């Protein structure tokens, strides 16, 4: 689940499955998905009153993972500028 709102401009968010390594605390990424957010300067501000959903079921199956199994989900944000890997504009992806 993704709580989206008006960024100053348009950008791509990519979705990764972080599987902690046994000993000890570790991370992270396996490519789950990607979706985009459109926008521009001087746009009318907005905030979705609900979560956007992205089905990661099959990628979780391909890692042998489960809803109960231990993992987390991290988005990596890339503006259309090419730059940059932008940081933490939306709340962290919820797991439904």
């Amino acid at each position: 689940g993704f709580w989206l709102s008006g960024i100053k401009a348009s950008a791509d968010v990519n979705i990764h499955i972080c599987v902690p390594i046994g000993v000890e605390h570790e991370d992270c990424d396996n490519y789950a998905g990607t979706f985009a957010v459109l926008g521009g300067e001087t746009e009318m501000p907005w905030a979705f009153d609900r979560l956007f959903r992205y089905e990661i079921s099959d990628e979780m199956k391909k890692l042998q993972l489960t809803e109960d199994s231990k993992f987390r989900l991290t988005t990596n944000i890339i503006a259309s500028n090419g730059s940059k890997v932008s940081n933490d504009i939306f709340p962290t992806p919820t797991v439904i």
Binding site: L4, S5, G6, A9, S10, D12, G33, T34, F35, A36, V37, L38, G39, G40, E41, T42, E43, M44, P45, W46, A47, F48, D49, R50, F52, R53, E55, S80, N81, G82
Partner: protein, 192 residues
Amino acid sequence: KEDMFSLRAAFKRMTDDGRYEEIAAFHGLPAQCPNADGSNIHTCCLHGMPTFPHWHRLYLSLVENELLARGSDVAVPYWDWIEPFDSLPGLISDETYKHPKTNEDIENPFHHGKISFADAVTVRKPRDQLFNNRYLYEHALFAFEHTDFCDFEVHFEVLHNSIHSWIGGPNPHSMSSLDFAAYDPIFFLHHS
């Protein structure tokens, strides 16, 4: 090919006259929507709201209307990106097509739109993600799953954003930016 060349000449006739630019200004970066008190001027198109489809449902209508009045053989077509493809459709992709009527090769009107108040033209930097993407299909299936309208709309609109991004990646005057995306003909072909 006949329907194509009819669409091409209709839109070209529409573009030589200053019309489609004026229509793209409805959506585009020259802001006409100010106020209510503000005063701040905003781009007129609505993109955060659940009334996003409706708005764009109008826009396409408009262009197609004015297109058919220019003598087009057919209404504005939809190109279905849901079906994977190694290359962009012939209509928009190539910079020039052969004109059977004039027996010479002429610029494709659906290739690029000109943005004349900035002395610019639209370009397209196609991200490699765009091609052979089978993801969009399952995405659409989940869009259709939604019973409630607002859920439908949010998933539908994010999915709509996907191509906007992947078609015009890096250039500022492009499909990737909400500001200038309207000036590229592909816009309505996508939105239909």
